[PDB]
Amino acid sequence: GHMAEKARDSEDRMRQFITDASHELRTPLTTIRGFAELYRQGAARDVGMLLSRIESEASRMGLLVDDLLLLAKL
Amino acid sequence: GHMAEKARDSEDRMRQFITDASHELRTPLTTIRGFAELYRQGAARDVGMLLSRIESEASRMGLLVDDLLLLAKL
Ligand SMILES: [K+]
């Protein structure tokens, strides 16, 4: 009945979140990897921009991870 | 009733799963972030080593994330 429905709706919504989050974490991770490669190969300049980009991507990932943790507690 | 109880149990395991999985991502992330802050503070002598660790943690998270993506389907 209705309580089973709410719990199920809640589980389904969480499952989708984890899907979307995981897809969205994949993108920063590929960015870090790709940029790191280019830099190692000598194809780029300003290592401070590489590290600033890594800092940015990591901060974004932090917020995604924390969103999941908080969702779990709501 | 029975339906609600099974449904809640399934929902609470999903929440538990989401908490575990997210804490597991958090750990390599705090490394990447910490290492990038070291660099911004002027403290990095061997950036290649710093970058290597960063790459290693990113690849580790990459695998965690790919596995989460598959588990969210089960
Ligand atoms: K499941």
Automatic annotation (TrEMBL), chains A, B:
Localization terms from the record: Cell membrane
Protein name per its UniProtKB record: histidine kinase
Whole-protein residues included: 240 to 310 of 485
